């Protein structure tokens with residue numbers, strides 16, 4: 001061990017400088033202590049307690065949960081595979097300060113299977129702490145969570161926005177929202193104020209946008225009648241694709257609101273479920289939570305996560321069940337140790 | 341020559357031969373001399389001075405066709421003749437409540453005198469409103485006695501009206517679970533018991549019909565309406581609706597009056613009252629929280645800004661919101677506000 005140390009390939013934008021395979025040491029610019037040893041063509045990250053000329057010091061373990069945590073989607077990560085015992089650590093660098101998406105792609109190559117399956121896998125974070133993973137699958141699952149702004153499965157579950165691939169009209173003529181409601185698809189994608197071009201601009205595939213001809217810009221009576229006489233069912237694949245585009249688009253509005261608040265962290269530093277809770281309430285009540293959910297926003301900007309659970313439990317807005325489910329997401333992050 | 345001058349009845353909580361003219365100063369007033377003839381109070385006014393008649397009173401600017409007097413005020417209703425700085429009026433109601441006046445003026449024994457003279461209201465502030473006819477004054481009275489206009493409130497443009505048990509939501513929607521069995525103009529029984537309705541003044545016969553509808557919400561209310569709907573008579577449904585509309589109106593009234601603006605809710609014209617209650621009834625009564633832009637304009641008495649505030653709410657209920665704005669605008673146009 002470490003097994004297959006020069007197998008596979010390494011994703012690195014940094015590629016430093018008679019093709020010689022003597023060991024070369026370098027300090028990776030933006031940081032210390034990040035000494036790298038290049039043997040053959042490959043970067044090797046080593047640590048030891050004992051002070052040295054060419055090894056890094058022992059890195060602190062991150063408090064981030066390996067089973068349920070995420071790293072900020074706005075951060076580059078370093079992925080390493082290797083072995084460690086008694087104050088000596090030797091890791092082949094597999095991804096060196098690469099994006100989450102690049103990493104996910106890079107880690108799924110058959111070339112890297114041998115090395116990733118027969119060594120301990122870890123992520124070295126930008127803050128220079130490390131997350132040690134039980135296995136490569138766990139690491140891969142951590143990255144998958146991390147790259148999403150919200151948890152689209154919770155979002156489209158029945159406890160939240162639900163999911164109906166058939167054109168639906170979620171109001172009735174006795175309802176107060178009758179005239180503002182339009183033809184709806186998937187998880188709350190309402191076409192009442194949207195044209196085909198709007199959807200293309202938002203990156204909806206043409207094959208999907210074409211399908212929705214006749215459902216655009218219809219509201220109230222016309223949307224209601226249209227659904228009753230000529231409905232349309234998308235396939236689950238297309239409806240999820242269309243839903244996620246709008247979920248993510250909406251999420252970025254909540255994100256900017258959060259970020260502009262300057263509370264000492266960014267939206268991407270919050271755990272996935274809590275981001276999902278905040279987006280869920282926004283999607284339903286309007287995104288400017290400072291006005292549409294003052295008691296929630298208060299707890300948020302205060303980073304009072306227990307208080308945030310209390311706030312959700314405490315609003316009666318005719319939608320208290322959905323609010324309790326949102327507070328339950330935050331409470332999960334609390335109980336998991338992701339918040340505080 | 342007031343036809344039937346000594347006919348009919350006079351409503352007055354204040355008060356052998358009575359065939360002699362007796363004169364008094366109406367107690368808590370000033371320039372309110374009365375003359376009792378044959379047992380009936382006579383309000384006289386003369387231009388050129390006298391010491392048995394009052395000085396001529398100023399005409400109120402309150403609109404006789406669309407205006408109201410505050411339902412918290414007592415009024416004097418007089419019917420008679422006037423010309424050339426000589427006014428002589430038989431008092432029909434002396435400082436009575438609005439409701440008292442409505443009832444009194446609709447008695448058959450007074451029909452004749454009210455039909456054949458000029459009818460007016462002497463207000464508490466001693467200003468007068470002159471009416472083209474008794475029917476007009478009676479309608480003016482009916483507007484004044486109601487805190488909001490129930491017909492507008494219950495019209496399709498506003499809260500609407502459906503005497504049949506209905507469930508104004510569906511399982512998809514946000515509010516499916518908080519919605520209960522509803523009757524008339526938005527009376528929701530989801531958090532109400534038969535006793536609550538009885539406490540609120542609902543008659544037993546109406547309350548009794550609703551037994552299986554109380555306290556149901558969400559799925560249970562939704563199913564109940566589908567499986568066992570009930571249609572109330574229009575009269576019973578209006579009775580029930582009007583109790584809750586009025587109860588809600590008093591909540592808004594209290595908030596308005598607590599703001600110290602300084603006029604009381606009862607001093608606003610009817611249609612503007614209706615507008616404010618209608619938005620409260622639908623969005624939550626705490627308007628400073630549920631509709632701040634509207635509330636902030638109200639308490640600043642910025643009536644034009646009030647219309648704009650209504651016109652610019654985006655809450656997914658734009659149509660109704662603009663109709664409420666339109667009520668306020670009508671009051672501005674009628675010269676009732678500002």
Ligand SMILES: [Mg+2]
Nearest residue numbers: 526621622623
């Ligand atoms: Mg309502």
